[PDB]
Amino acid sequence: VLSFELLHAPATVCGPKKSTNLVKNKCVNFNFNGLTGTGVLTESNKKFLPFQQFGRDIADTTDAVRDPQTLEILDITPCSFGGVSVITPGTNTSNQVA
């Protein structure tokens, strides 16, 4: 018979650790240790100190992460995005657009 109890002390036996394969150089949704986001994950030479888990740019925005399953310090590029604009002659003259 196995007994399960829960107290105020921090539990050391969890056995959950949701994880997946790790995909570089594509736009992807991601989570690292509870840091959620979406973007293009890439390799980096950024020298995280051993206790550092995440990296940030000048405007406080995240730019890098440690993979908790390897030594990899990734750099996170945002999703490629931009405004879409339609070039048109006047519709009175033609229906073509670019």
């Binding site: 740019d57 000048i58 405007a59 925005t61 945002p78 995005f81």
Partner: peptide
């Protein structure tokens, strides 16, 4: 203009040098 160069003048180059998320 200096034709050997963005074909800016000499004084335009000083001005383009001194003047100095998503």
């Amino acid at each position: 203009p200096d034709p050997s160069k963005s074909k800016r003048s000499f004084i335009e180059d000083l001005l383009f040098n001194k003047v100095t998320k998503f």
